[PDB]
Design a protein around this nucleic acid. Structure first.
Ligand SMILES: [Mn+2]
Ligand SMILES: [Mn+2]
Ligand SMILES: [Mn+2]
Ligand SMILES: [Mn+2]
Ligand SMILES: [Mn+2]
Ligand SMILES: [Mn+2]
Ligand SMILES: [Mn+2]
Ligand SMILES: [Mn+2]
Ligand SMILES: [Mn+2]
Ligand SMILES: [Mn+2]
Ligand SMILES: [Mn+2]
Ligand SMILES: [Mn+2]
Ligand SMILES: [Mn+2]
Ligand SMILES: [Mn+2]
Ligand SMILES: [Mn+2]
Ligand SMILES: [Mn+2]
Ligand SMILES: [Mn+2]
Ligand SMILES: [Mn+2]
Ligand SMILES: [Mn+2]
Ligand SMILES: [Mn+2]
Ligand SMILES: [Mn+2]
Lengths: 78, 99, 103, 97, 94, 105, 83, 98
DNA sequence: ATCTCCAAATATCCCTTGCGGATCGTAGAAAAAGTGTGTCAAACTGCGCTATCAAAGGGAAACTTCAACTGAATTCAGTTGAAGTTTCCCTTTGATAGCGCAGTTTGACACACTTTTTCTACGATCCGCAAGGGATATTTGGAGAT
DNA sequence: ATCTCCAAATATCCCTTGCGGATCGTAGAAAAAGTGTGTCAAACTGCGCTATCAAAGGGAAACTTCAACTGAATTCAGTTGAAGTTTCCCTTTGATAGCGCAGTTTGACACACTTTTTCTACGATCCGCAAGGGATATTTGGAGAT
């Protein structure tokens, strides 16, 4: 599934970040970094879901989790 | 009727009002409005959070306009802070006049 | 309405209720929600003023998230205030490092 | 006709910095989220916006990281981002020890 | 006037773990900051959880999920069992 | 048993913690088990830092724990380092650490 | 009496000691003024908040707690001086 | 006469300072700087002595750790010498501004 | 290879202190008890929105071809920072005295809270039509070749 | 420089859909009224903050010398990016199945609150004594010299 985050997708992300040239080894690092990012946010989001005794992860569970991580997101129920 | 979907509350109408004050011929998309609502909520929480700590720090039981003011001074960068202190002081001055 | 007495578009009554329910303190004085409502109104004005202009510059009559982001990141003080916030669907400021451009 | 190496890359930079669309395809991203969640708690559903919230946060995060990664590459007098640039940026951010 | 601290409890726990070890005045002030800081972080998170879920009360369940949000790995696991064991033992009495 | 700490098997003060929870404006109401659980968590974390800091003190041929030992303890422990990742321990100094490239050849 | 230029009291040998503690082997002559500028900005930011706490309390003496509270505000929590 | 080679004394200075915990900035000078900066925000301030010590503890800690990051930036660029551009890269990635 | 020698480490002496362990006497807070009351658990429920399904086309991802231009290695020299020396500035240390102001306290009350009734702002819900979407054409800004 | 030649920017026009205004209906804000306690202002006060001086001497500043660092310049293997072909799978569209979120009602009991009893933990205070920690002399590990 981590391989669904393709080389072209990572290149596009890098282009928006202003990158002109990318070593072949970047695509594997990026996948690892993203996995860590998602695990940390989802871990917390799921802690909230479970605390509410729910089976469904809400956008608010994510929003609160992002806020905890110091990654406040506007646009989804802030 | 009978079974009623819970009323959601937002700042959308007051944001559209302010938008008419500053940009009479400018509109706002619904995604942009959501961002604006998060902004207002985020800022409210941040300010009232300081105000709460301030009162606690000082062994007081009340959040007054004084805590709001110093909280705005802690939270906001230079010019924004200056302008927000004017606007808050003026609203309070004007409100206590109007009886 | 208390908002009218204060000269505000933002709701002094709603703000007061929200301060009382947020467990910030035992008691809320009467000037507090006026001051706070005024500050929230001033900041939404400040943001909307710059976003409107970014909409103008982009030849549009409706503020979208992109214009909110442009406004914020092009403004030194708003960029600081929202230094740890991400605006959904905002993208980034056009920015290419000098050394990456051809001679 | 052939554009020189870097000319199309530079065009791409200009293109993506003008837009705001998500750059990771939606379904592969959704599968990843569900797989990671499953590891923490089995038998979970997601609101569609929950997944969208996570994709917006994730891409915002990675774009900004590539910005810092690029600066570290440039610092080293290179033009090519390398894993070590990501690692240095993450160390300075205090994301990694 | 009275300055309350965690000092006597930190002393007690220090005797349990390292019976012949003292602690300097500055080291203890640091331990007091530590205990207050963690209290604040946990109570704060618990406060948020009750609000998020529209409850009027902080129960040990809020404290527990606050603990799981705030502490890393092994530390959350052992704090959870210490916390649960204490609530269990406490209810068993009156 | 008289004290709530005694009932809970605890060294830390359940009653003080209850009061501090009530007077900190965290919620309108605090349940009976909240201060027990938190007192226990606080007690456990203090046991863990004190254990590691006493060991640092002994590593250093010392009999009394000073801030340096607390600092050595915290930063050599991955999880305590993380919990206190944005915390400064006064008079702690840093860990001995020279980058390889700086050593002579 | 007027206070001026007190940043120059943050001497070069002092900055060098801090860099040694930070593990630094070799230091460019240009570091010292860069460091002064950086320290100035750090102190201005913390002191500004610390003074806001003093003013709020209607006091004329900046207490250790005003500084500890300001440091916490800036994500730079300090242990050892109360709180 | 005896002369240690360049870098030998630097290394032993690092060992020396990495073992100790004492503040490395002279005390009266730091206190004047604090007092000057404060006066620019409010005239007529007094300071508890512990207030100034807290600021010196925080400041030196901040600067030690910034020097660690600065060194990593220098090493990344294949140098052993810290330069203003290393501090700048470090502060930029930290999100420190002004 | 082997010697010389510098500074950090080790050893010795006295001694100030700041620790753990007292005992004290005592304010303040915790526990104990009694009663008032509102939060939230459970149970029953309705339906919004999450999951899923079946298919198909079109574009994205993967794969392949080529060589431009990049990162990495090598060499070398001017630049520059480290090491060491000498001078003496001004920090540190200690102790004094004056008072500015932080912190305690006590009466008076203004202000916030709680309760109940009335009034009306802002919510949900609806949809004409204008801004923006999307497709096609033409103009404009440059990049690469000659 | 000058011509060719891509691809983005702009123009133009028709289609789509979500902005934004209008309509109905109530949850929440305001008015009114009665109640008490936190806050405020004013009186007094002694901790510790400012200040100042003195004496000594640790450490800063300013110098000379030159080791070795930075970085300029050069080289080239190969890893990149650009543009070709081939292969896969994302998205879009139309619902149908039904999970589980969220709306409504409820009374038990958990938690509030206030008063009296019990006892914890604080502030003040002396004490044994290893624990440093500063002043003085000797040995040691290894850097640099011969
Ligand atoms: Mn205008
Ligand atoms: Mn399932
Ligand atoms: Mn000045
Ligand atoms: Mn003692
Ligand atoms: Mn009493
Ligand atoms: Mn190159
Ligand atoms: Mn190579
Ligand atoms: Mn050269
Ligand atoms: Mn020089
Ligand atoms: Mn001189
Ligand atoms: Mn006063
Ligand atoms: Mn149009
Ligand atoms: Mn269009
Ligand atoms: Mn042209
Ligand atoms: Mn609308
Ligand atoms: Mn109502
Ligand atoms: Mn009065
Ligand atoms: Mn000296
Ligand atoms: Mn080749
Ligand atoms: Mn069901
Ligand atoms: Mn030898």
């Amino acid at each position: 599934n981590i391989q669904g985050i393709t080389k072209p997708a990572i290149r596009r992300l890098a282009r928006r970040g202003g990158v002109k040239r990318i070593s072949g080894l970047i695509y594997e690092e990026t996948r690892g970094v993203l996995k860590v990012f998602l695990e940390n946010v989802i871990r917390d989001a799921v802690t909230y879901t479970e605390h509410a005794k729910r089976k469904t992860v809400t956008a608010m569970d994510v929003v609160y989790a992002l806020k905890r991580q110091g990654r406040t997101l506007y646009g989804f129920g802030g | 009727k009978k079974r009623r979907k819970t009323r959601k509350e937002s700042y959308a109408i007051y944001v559209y009002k302010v938008l008419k004050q500053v940009h009479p011929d400018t509109g706002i998309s619904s995604k942009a409005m959501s961002i604006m609502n998060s902004f207002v909520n985020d800022v409210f929480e941040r300010i009232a959070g300081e105000a709460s700590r301030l009162a606690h720090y000082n062994k007081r039981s009340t959040i007054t306009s004084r805590e709001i003011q110093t909280a705005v001074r802690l939270l906001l960068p230079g010019e924004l802070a200056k302008h927000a202190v004017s606007e808050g002081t003026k609203a309070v001055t004007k409100y206590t006049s109007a009886k | 309405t208390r908002s009218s007495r204060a000269g505000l578009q933002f709701p002094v009554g709603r703000v007061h209720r929200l301060l009382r329910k947020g467990n910030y303190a035992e008691r809320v004085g009467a000037g507090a929600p006026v001051y706070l409502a005024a500050v929230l109104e001033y900041l939404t004005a400040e943001i909307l003023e710059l976003a409107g202009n970014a909409a103008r510059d982009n030849k549009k009559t409706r503020i979208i998230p992109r214009h909110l982001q442009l406004a914020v990141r092009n403004d030194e003080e708003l960029n600081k205030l929202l230094g740890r916030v991400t605006i959904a669907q905002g993208g980034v400021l056009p920015n290419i490092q000098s050394v990456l451009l051809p001679k | 006709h052939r554009y020189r190496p870097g000319t199309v890359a530079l065009r791409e930079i200009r293109r993506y910095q003008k837009s705001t669309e998500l750059l990771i395809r939606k379904l592969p991203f959704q599968r990843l989220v569900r797989e990671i969640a499953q590891d923490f708690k089995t038998d979970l559903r997601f609101q569609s916006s929950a997944v969208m919230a996570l994709q917006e946060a994730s891409e915002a995060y990675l774009v900004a990281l590539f910005e810092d990664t690029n600066l570290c590459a440039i610092h080293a007098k290179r033009v090519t981002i390398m894993p070590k640039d990501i690692q240095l940026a993450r160390r300075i951010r205090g994301e990694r020890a």
